[PDB]
Amino acid sequence: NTVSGVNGPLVILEKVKFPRYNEIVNLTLPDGTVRQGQVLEIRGDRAIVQVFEGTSGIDVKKTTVEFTGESLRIPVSEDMLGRIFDGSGRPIDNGPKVFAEDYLDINGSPINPYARIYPEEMISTGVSAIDTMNSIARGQKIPIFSASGLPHNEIAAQICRQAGLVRPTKDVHDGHEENFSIVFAAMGVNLETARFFKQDFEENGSLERTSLFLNLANDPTIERIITPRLALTTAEYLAYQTERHVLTILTDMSSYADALREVSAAREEVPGRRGYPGYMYTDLSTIYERAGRVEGRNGSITQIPILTMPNDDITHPIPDLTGYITEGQIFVDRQLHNKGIYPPINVLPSLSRLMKSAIGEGMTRKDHGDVSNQLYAKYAIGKDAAAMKAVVGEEALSIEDKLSLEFLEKFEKTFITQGAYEDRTVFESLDQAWSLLRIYPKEMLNRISPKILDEFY
Amino acid sequence: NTVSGVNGPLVILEKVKFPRYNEIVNLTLPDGTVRQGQVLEIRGDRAIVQVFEGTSGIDVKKTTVEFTGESLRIPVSEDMLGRIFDGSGRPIDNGPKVFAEDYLDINGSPINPYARIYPEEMISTGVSAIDTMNSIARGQKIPIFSASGLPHNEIAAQICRQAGLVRPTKDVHDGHEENFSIVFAAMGVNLETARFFKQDFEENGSLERTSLFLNLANDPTIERIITPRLALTTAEYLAYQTERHVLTILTDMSSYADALREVSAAREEVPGRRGYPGYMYTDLSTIYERAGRVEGRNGSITQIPILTMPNDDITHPIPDLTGYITEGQIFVDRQLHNKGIYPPINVLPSLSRLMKSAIGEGMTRKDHGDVSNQLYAKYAIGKDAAAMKAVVGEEALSIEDKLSLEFLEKFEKTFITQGAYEDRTVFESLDQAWSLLRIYPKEMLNRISPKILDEFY
Amino acid sequence: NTVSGVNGPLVILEKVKFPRYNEIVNLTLPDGTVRQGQVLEIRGDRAIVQVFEGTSGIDVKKTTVEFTGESLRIPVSEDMLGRIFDGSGRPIDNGPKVFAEDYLDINGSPINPYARIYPEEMISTGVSAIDTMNSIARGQKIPIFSASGLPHNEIAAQICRQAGLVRPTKDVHDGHEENFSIVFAAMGVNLETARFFKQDFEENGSLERTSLFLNLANDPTIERIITPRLALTTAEYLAYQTERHVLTILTDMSSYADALREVSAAREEVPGRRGYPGYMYTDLSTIYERAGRVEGRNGSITQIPILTMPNDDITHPIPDLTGYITEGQIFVDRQLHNKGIYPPINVLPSLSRLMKSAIGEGMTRKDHGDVSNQLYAKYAIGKDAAAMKAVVGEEALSIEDKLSLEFLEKFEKTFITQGAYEDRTVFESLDQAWSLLRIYPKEMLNRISPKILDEFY
Amino acid sequence: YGAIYSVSGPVVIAENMIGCAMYELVKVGHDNLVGEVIRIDGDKATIQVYEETAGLTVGDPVLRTGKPLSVELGPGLMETIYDGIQRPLKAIKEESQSIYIPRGIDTPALDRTIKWQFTPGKFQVGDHISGGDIYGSVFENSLISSHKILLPPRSRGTITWIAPAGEYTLDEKILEVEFDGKKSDFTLYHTWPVRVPRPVTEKLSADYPLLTGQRVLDALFPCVQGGTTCIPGAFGCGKTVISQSLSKYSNSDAIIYVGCGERGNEMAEVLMEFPELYTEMSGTKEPIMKRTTLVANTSNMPVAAREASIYTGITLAEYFRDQGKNVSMIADSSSRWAEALREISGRLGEMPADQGFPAYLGAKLASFYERAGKAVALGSPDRTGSVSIVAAVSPAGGDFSDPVTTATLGITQVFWGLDKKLAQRKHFPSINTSVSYSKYTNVLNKFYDSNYPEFPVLRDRMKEILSNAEELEQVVQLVGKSALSDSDKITLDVATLIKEDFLQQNGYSTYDAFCPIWKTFDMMRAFISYHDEAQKAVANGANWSKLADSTGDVKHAVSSSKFFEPSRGEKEVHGEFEKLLSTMQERFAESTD
Amino acid sequence: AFIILDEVIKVTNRRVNAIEHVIIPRTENTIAYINSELDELDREEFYRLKK
Structure with missing residues (x-):
């Protein structure tokens, strides 16, 4: 029909009642430009659409509507790596075209087949603090919690690039037997960021390794929400049909959450805690549910979402929600970054509750998990002692505390300090970790089972 | 009188003008069960009812309604006592109707003479910590402020138990010369705790003297608020017609308060501060209305409400509005509880203003208000002396602060710490208080007349 | 036609579209009471009027309307000086009105000619503590930030009365030659407070030089928000047309902000933090647009608003936004009031943004900047010295602290403490500065050029 | 209809x-x-x-x-307890058997059955009259005729008929005015709408005090009649006590006691206290109660009534102001009245924008308060009247930076503090110097200088001691002091005394809260003198411990002098204090050498 | 005196550290977190009344 009105990202159509929910419609501007949207609400003889593309210039009887008569599905192909796409279901970059062999829905249940069997295969990042203290699995979800003084993009790229070199070393070990694929999606970040990422992937290896979805900040909030959904379709097909392990790097996850926030402000929808939607739980879930092993059980989708915290607080709604849902927490610290530690990952609150699922034992040691717990415990004591060193001085602290202050310093500067291309095998990391444990005496290492301490020291 | 719609438990009826405010309706369901409901609002060509038994079975054209023709009134008996009753009455709790002697309006429309007559003589609760510090007088409302993380239930139980054990000690004192009756109205309390209340009355042998109305937290919200209103009407019958001293315990005011919030989310009336009604105060005041001394001095109703602070602050709505109406407050203590004390209240936030003028003589002394004041002063300082020790050390502490520290402990574990079957005379309380208070010279004590302090030092 | 209804001070009249925006309409009641209103909003087939006169006792069927045909404008003359008016410009001097030479728009002003040549020349108030530490330039917006533990109003009479008597003392320095007028607006004033200002200006011989507008805390809000608007216009007519410096004193800004909160929800709009409008700013800015030097470059509208916070609350929107537009603020101390130093203003948290460029010449010295530095730094060390003394003793106090200890009491008792009719320009302030400073040696006075110092120590 | x-x-x-x-x-x-x-x-x-x-x-x-x-103003208002629109409670109490008026039952504002004694005025047949003039009187009250029968504000004309003296009813006619034909018959009672303020000829300067009798009130800043005053409360800081004590000391000719939405036991208490308690000068017969008109609303009554309560009270205060009587409006608590506006705001279906309180709140709180003050009586005969409003205010948002408290501090001129934590140690009212201010100080202190007190001097010094003491106290806590300058200990020590003698008072011990304005002057005089000797002694040499111990006997006596009230003579400056002064100097010498 | 000064300095060095490191960030975190929750209750109400 024709546009009735427009109030923000919501468009009021006066139409007829034949449309179905999320059925595509195309808005024909008087310029003769077509932009796409999907109906968010349908009522009798009228619709509310949210348009992906644009949010202004929308007329009345000079404008027209046309129905596509297909509710939105993403055209998925398995020849997607190396190929350049834009976050809009097609490239607007003029990159190699998407093609379709299935079109798969982004609602969060197309044909979805996931974990009835939990991850047991270890996948390494080449970084000790990640791998040893928390571990990463063939379905693991780990949030990178970052800040406005940390460089989020440099760490994001760091984890991805080094996990591509380690992952074939692990294929030979028989941790794997199937392909590796990267799906990189950037949604609504700066130009400066976008360019940087592509440059990073090229240096380490190639861009044949990865598939790229690029979405620009100048493009709307409505576009931004569809951008990860496009990533999900890509990854699920690859795992399902061609038994490939898929690694998704989703940047920026915070970018996506602010978008949700905008479609409740310029909607009449009342928001929940701290101005973030009440139905914010469901929006976030959609990304995280579509993870784990994929049917055949040689395919998988593994997630590393990248969150930048704006206030850097742990009372902000985004970091909290994400944490309950995700299988691990990786906290990256501004204070380490300042001191000259790269990567500057603080493990004080990094925790996995699904620690068993995260570790490996058939392509990693059984001792891996036992040592990690002890290390974490001994790091924590070393932090309690650090605060006490400032207050009390060395004028009353105990013999035991002194060992813990030394351990803390040796631990930051050796374990967490690694070259920009220097990759550590998980077995070598144990040897490093054992050096860290070795200064404490056999009565301070009392919590650990006697069997392990007498065996390996 | 057919249903237009149902939104929530609230039902929109079409009917034509007839019903008066709070006129009962009978809901005829097509399953062959009649359920009762109250008109909350009467309007032009519709009335809106909220149903007391469930909300199930409401249809549009398969339901019919017929009018009771009668505004809500309580069927009252004085043989109601010695028996278990319920808001609507159930046969499975042995009490399917009171078998009325009189129908009295629950709004005290026949007559309601209260609050132009001043409180009479002191009454024993058997707890030293209440009785000295706060004056509980017949024909007064003094509330118990309670808190979460603490069994508030246990405090209510101690009051029920000690009620009727005090009354022969008083009969000799000349504090009593008329019957004692307990009216227990339970609403929204846990099911397990309801059963503990029932056992306490039987054990003491005070089952005879009490009537129970029990409203669960699965019984509808409008029904829930009406149950305490029923029990107070019953108290007015006994107090005024047959000259009983009534002690009515109304637990738990938090469940009443919650109910207020959930209703009016579908009327024209629309909640106040933080989603709690602005007219929450009006509700409260209807409960406080039927309490007080009675004209011509036939009997009294005394009321001890139990409030649970849900956030553990008294700056929250439930303590805040209630506290302005009430003549003082007795607020519990979180800290004592952890230690293990029972009853665990504290005296610093507890004050009754009308203490000096209210009380009798011949089992409560003249020195009663004097000694309370002194006991609080030494305790304020003791609490603070702990705080200065934490930060700096023994640096701002002195001979005066060091005494006060000793005071805070001896008082906490001797005065406040008692049994839950211990009956303590107001004469006993004062004797013990003076013994404790010997810790400072007569010249350091000037919060008391020098006349009084020599007699009783 | 008739009045359709009333809801609050909002009057809904059923009329076509006949009044233009801001057109005064006369509601004619037949009971000897004529009332005037302004259409606040005009909508289709209805208009919303808020009445200047009353708020209740309006008929909804016996009222008739007449259109004045004149949108709100202020009759401005200059024989207004030496006369007391109310909040709508009607005289409370009694006797015939003054009328106009112009009707000028109050809404934002019909020509707005305000500064793009920043403030030069010094304005004195008559108090050394304000002048030297917190210098005010012609057309510079420096308010007095006050609190409720002080009589904010008294301190305000004092600045007004003593201002423009400074201008003759300046004529002798030959810094001024132009006629000074003063505009006074009292908003939400008590009768007793109101009379206090009138009687004070009358003593000084400043009453002839000022016009006073009183809006009482009992008159409509709409009338009260208009009160500063009328005052800003009088000041502007005198600045522009007759090339005069006019100082306008706007007390109390909280009354005006409160009034806006009452009209926020009167309106069909939604407020911001803590219930205070998010478009509070827009309103405040209207005041501020009239503020500054007028084009002609020897006339100005200088503005001192007084804002009272409840207990120095900076959680409140009002000091945080108002403080942004303005260029510094003058903070008053309760601690000095309590000691009995009056005026009790403290010059250390107080600021003048541009202070070396907020003075002129021939009516200041160039030594002004150097002394502001010296005065400030020694008063701060003295504040530290008081606290120090108490811990260390006097038997262990430092020799520099002793000079600082004395400095603290003399700066307060000479510079800050002064009479209710004392007057000060920058030269007078400056002589008193050197006598406080004289006590410090030259080698402790090093923020000052060696030139100045050898002449004035 | x-x-x-x-x-x-x-x-x-x-x-x-x-x-x-x-x-x-x-x-x-x-x-x-x-x-x-x-x-x-x-x-x-x-x-x-x-x-x-x-x-x-x-x-x-x-x-x-x-x-x-409207409300009815006239004879028989005294010695009656009313609700918020005025109905005579006593008539209901016997008849209906209720205290909260049930539906089906109504009664009019004043009694109809009571005849009154009518006495003619100064005016006679042919004389022009207008609003607030005295048309006659009825003898009511203990000590003076308090009821002036006034022609209602804004009504004028000529009196054709003044009826002679005798006894008449108040539904009965006794005056006719001619102005546009016969204007109307008038009775004893005349009508005025409560939501509408009364007019006055003009506002006048406050310079006359009211004897509150509260030592701490009289000491720290002036007590004013014509006043505007707030005292913070919180329900559990002795606040009710100091209110009823205040009603008994008030030395105003009439007192109007206003229950906004109170406890209900207290509305019983004030009723019982009034006929059997004696006023400060002591009335003749039913001292307080004859002088009192009572508007009593509990929370349990209709919120419509509680909303109206305050208006009824101020119109009664204002009528009496126009009679040329000095009136005390004692209101407790405005926050309950504010809570009443809030109960109505949610029920009508309005939009609050002040934390669930109505937007309208600020205009109603202010409008009401402006009706108090000292003023020149409405009418031709010319008299002086005043209404001093002493108002309690309390939290309602739970904060102290909630709208209720924000609006009230702005409109008030006088604030005397109260702290809950210190109040518990029992020292109520436990005034906070920092939140306290008075605007009235200068004119009131000038007045007191004429009256005999040298007050103003002490006042600054009372405030000065309490201020430095406060600051010193944070420094003892924070650093955790290892020493003090010998002077600072004196400041702290002299402040402790101030706490006992003024701040610690109990409104039901009348030996421990009563002093006339001069007695108050003498006690404070003694303190300020002690500080003055003590500061000099350290200066001339002597240790603090020497100062405290040698001063000794007189230090005990001044501490213990708070247990006194006039009872050694009708004299307001006593031998008790005058003797102390010379002995104190004698003590000083000892300390010094 | 010298031995007495040495004993006192140690108590004094401990306090200067103690205030900065512990107290000041504990006050900051508590005030800001409560401020943020308190304003939220107030804002949502306005939105619900408006809706």
């Missing part, structure tokens, strides 16, 4: 109402209940109903009375 469309709470909607005013008294229902149409939106009138609802049906007739809600 009108028809009830809906009953929603205690608030009633009625259709078919037009040409009505916005304060019209309306009769709602078939029981003829009192109600008031605040607003009308089209044909629908929202009515605040000042009786209960438990059986109001739709389709019942609503009849407008054709006039505003």
Whole structure:
């Protein structure tokens, strides 16, 4: 029909009642430009659409509507790596075209087949603090919690690039037997960021390794929400049909959450805690549910979402929600970054509750998990002692505390300090970790089972 | 009188003008069960009812309604006592109707003479910590402020138990010369705790003297608020017609308060501060209305409400509005509880203003208000002396602060710490208080007349 | 036609579209009471009027309307000086009105000619503590930030009365030659407070030089928000047309902000933090647009608003936004009031943004900047010295602290403490500065050029 | 005429109402209940109903009375306890057997059956009269005739007939005015609408005090009649005690006691206290109660009444001000009144923008308060009247930076503090110097200088001690002191004394809270003198411990001098204090050497 | 005196550290977190009344 009105990202159509929910419609501007949207609400003889593309210039009887008569599905192909796409279901970059062999829905249940069997295969990042203290699995979800003084993009790229070199070393070990694929999606970040990422992937290896979805900040909030959904379709097909392990790097996850926030402000929808939607739980879930092993059980989708915290607080709604849902927490610290530690990952609150699922034992040691717990415990004591060193001085602290202050310093500067291309095998990391444990005496290492301490020291 | 719609438990009826405010309706369901409901609002060509038994079975054209023709009134008996009753009455709790002697309006429309007559003589609760510090007088409302993380239930139980054990000690004192009756109205309390209340009355042998109305937290919200209103009407019958001293315990005011919030989310009336009604105060005041001394001095109703602070602050709505109406407050203590004390209240936030003028003589002394004041002063300082020790050390502490520290402990574990079957005379309380208070010279004590302090030092 | 209804001070009249925006309409009641209103909003087939006169006792069927045909404008003359008016410009001097030479728009002003040549020349108030530490330039917006533990109003009479008597003392320095007028607006004033200002200006011989507008805390809000608007216009007519410096004193800004909160929800709009409008700013800015030097470059509208916070609350929107537009603020101390130093203003948290460029010449010295530095730094060390003394003793106090200890009491008792009719320009302030400073040696006075110092120590 | 469309709470909607005013008294229902149409939106009138609802049906007739809600001002107001629109409680108590007026039952504001003694004025047949003039008097009160029968404000004309002395009723006619034909018959009582303020000839300067009798009040800043005063409360800081004590000391000719939405036991208490308690000068017969008119509302009464309570009280205060009587308006607590506006805001279906309190709150809180003050009496005979409002204020948002407290501090001129934590240690009122201010100080202190006290000097010094003491106390806590300068200990020590003698008072021990304004001057005089000797002694040499110990005997006596009140003579400056002064100097010498 | 000064300095060095490191960030975190929750209750109400 024709546009009735427009109030923000919501468009009021006066139409007829034949449309179905999320059925595509195309808005024909008087310029003769077509932009796409999907109906968010349908009522009798009228619709509310949210348009992906644009949010202004929308007329009345000079404008027209046309129905596509297909509710939105993403055209998925398995020849997607190396190929350049834009976050809009097609490239607007003029990159190699998407093609379709299935079109798969982004609602969060197309044909979805996931974990009835939990991850047991270890996948390494080449970084000790990640791998040893928390571990990463063939379905693991780990949030990178970052800040406005940390460089989020440099760490994001760091984890991805080094996990591509380690992952074939692990294929030979028989941790794997199937392909590796990267799906990189950037949604609504700066130009400066976008360019940087592509440059990073090229240096380490190639861009044949990865598939790229690029979405620009100048493009709307409505576009931004569809951008990860496009990533999900890509990854699920690859795992399902061609038994490939898929690694998704989703940047920026915070970018996506602010978008949700905008479609409740310029909607009449009342928001929940701290101005973030009440139905914010469901929006976030959609990304995280579509993870784990994929049917055949040689395919998988593994997630590393990248969150930048704006206030850097742990009372902000985004970091909290994400944490309950995700299988691990990786906290990256501004204070380490300042001191000259790269990567500057603080493990004080990094925790996995699904620690068993995260570790490996058939392509990693059984001792891996036992040592990690002890290390974490001994790091924590070393932090309690650090605060006490400032207050009390060395004028009353105990013999035991002194060992813990030394351990803390040796631990930051050796374990967490690694070259920009220097990759550590998980077995070598144990040897490093054992050096860290070795200064404490056999009565301070009392919590650990006697069997392990007498065996390996 | 057919249903237009149902939104929530609230039902929109079409009917034509007839019903008066709070006129009962009978809901005829097509399953062959009649359920009762109250008109909350009467309007032009519709009335809106909220149903007391469930909300199930409401249809549009398969339901019919017929009018009771009668505004809500309580069927009252004085043989109601010695028996278990319920808001609507159930046969499975042995009490399917009171078998009325009189129908009295629950709004005290026949007559309601209260609050132009001043409180009479002191009454024993058997707890030293209440009785000295706060004056509980017949024909007064003094509330118990309670808190979460603490069994508030246990405090209510101690009051029920000690009620009727005090009354022969008083009969000799000349504090009593008329019957004692307990009216227990339970609403929204846990099911397990309801059963503990029932056992306490039987054990003491005070089952005879009490009537129970029990409203669960699965019984509808409008029904829930009406149950305490029923029990107070019953108290007015006994107090005024047959000259009983009534002690009515109304637990738990938090469940009443919650109910207020959930209703009016579908009327024209629309909640106040933080989603709690602005007219929450009006509700409260209807409960406080039927309490007080009675004209011509036939009997009294005394009321001890139990409030649970849900956030553990008294700056929250439930303590805040209630506290302005009430003549003082007795607020519990979180800290004592952890230690293990029972009853665990504290005296610093507890004050009754009308203490000096209210009380009798011949089992409560003249020195009663004097000694309370002194006991609080030494305790304020003791609490603070702990705080200065934490930060700096023994640096701002002195001979005066060091005494006060000793005071805070001896008082906490001797005065406040008692049994839950211990009956303590107001004469006993004062004797013990003076013994404790010997810790400072007569010249350091000037919060008391020098006349009084020599007699009783 | 008739009045359709009333809801609050909002009057809904059923009329076509006949009044233009801001057109005064006369509601004619037949009971000897004529009332005037302004259409606040005009909508289709209805208009919303808020009445200047009353708020209740309006008929909804016996009222008739007449259109004045004149949108709100202020009759401005200059024989207004030496006369007391109310909040709508009607005289409370009694006797015939003054009328106009112009009707000028109050809404934002019909020509707005305000500064793009920043403030030069010094304005004195008559108090050394304000002048030297917190210098005010012609057309510079420096308010007095006050609190409720002080009589904010008294301190305000004092600045007004003593201002423009400074201008003759300046004529002798030959810094001024132009006629000074003063505009006074009292908003939400008590009768007793109101009379206090009138009687004070009358003593000084400043009453002839000022016009006073009183809006009482009992008159409509709409009338009260208009009160500063009328005052800003009088000041502007005198600045522009007759090339005069006019100082306008706007007390109390909280009354005006409160009034806006009452009209926020009167309106069909939604407020911001803590219930205070998010478009509070827009309103405040209207005041501020009239503020500054007028084009002609020897006339100005200088503005001192007084804002009272409840207990120095900076959680409140009002000091945080108002403080942004303005260029510094003058903070008053309760601690000095309590000691009995009056005026009790403290010059250390107080600021003048541009202070070396907020003075002129021939009516200041160039030594002004150097002394502001010296005065400030020694008063701060003295504040530290008081606290120090108490811990260390006097038997262990430092020799520099002793000079600082004395400095603290003399700066307060000479510079800050002064009479209710004392007057000060920058030269007078400056002589008193050197006598406080004289006590410090030259080698402790090093923020000052060696030139100045050898002449004035 | 009108028809009830809906009953929603205690608030009633009625259709078919037009040409009505916005304060019209309306009769709602078939029981003829009192109600008031605040607003009308089209044909629908929202009515605040000042009786209960438990059986109001739709389709019942609503009849407008054709006039505003007004109050009746005249004879027999004294010695009666009223609700918030005025109904005589006593008549109801025997007859209905109730205290909260039930539906089906109504009574008019004053009694009809009581005859009064009428005495003629100064005016005679032919004389022009206008508003606030004295047309006669009725002898009421203990000590003076308090009821001046005044012609209502804004009414004028000529009196054709002044009736002679005798006894007459107050529904009976005794005056006729001619102005546009016969204007009307007048009775003893005359009518005025409560939502409308009374006019006055003019406002006047406050310079006359009121004897509050509270030592701490009289000491720290002036006590003012014509006043505007706030005292913070919080419900559990001795606040009720100091209010009833205050009603008994007040030395004003009339006192109007206003229950906003109180405890209900207290509305019993003030009633019982008044006929059997003696005033400060001591009245003749039923001292306090004869002088008192009582508006008593508990929380349990209708919120429509609680809303009205404060208005009834101020119109009574204002009538009396115009009579040329000095009046005390004692109101407790405004926050409960504010809570009443809030109860109505949610029920009508308004938009609050002040933490669940109405947007309208600020204009109503202010408008009401401006009616108090000292003023020149309305009318030709010329008299002086005053209304001093002593108002308690309390939290209501739970904060202290909640709207209720923000609006009240701005409009008030006088604030004397109170702290809850110190109050618990028992030292109420436990005044906070920092939140306290007075604007009245200068004119009031000039007045007191004329009256004999050297007050102003002490006052600054009382404040100065308490201020430095405060600061010193944070420094003892924070650093955790290892020493003090010998002077600072004196400051702290002299402040402790101030706490006992003034701040620690109990309003039911009248030996421990009563002093006339001069007695107060002498006690403070003694303290300020002690500080003055003590500062000099350290300066001339002597240790603090030497200063404290050698001063000794006189230090005990001044501490213990708070247990006294005039009872050694009708004299306000005693030998008790004059003797101490010379002995104190004698003590000083000892300390020094 | 010298031995007495040495004993006192140690108590004094401990306090200067103690205030900065512990107290000041504990006050900051508590005030800001409560401020943020308190304003939220107030804002949502306005939105619900408006809706």
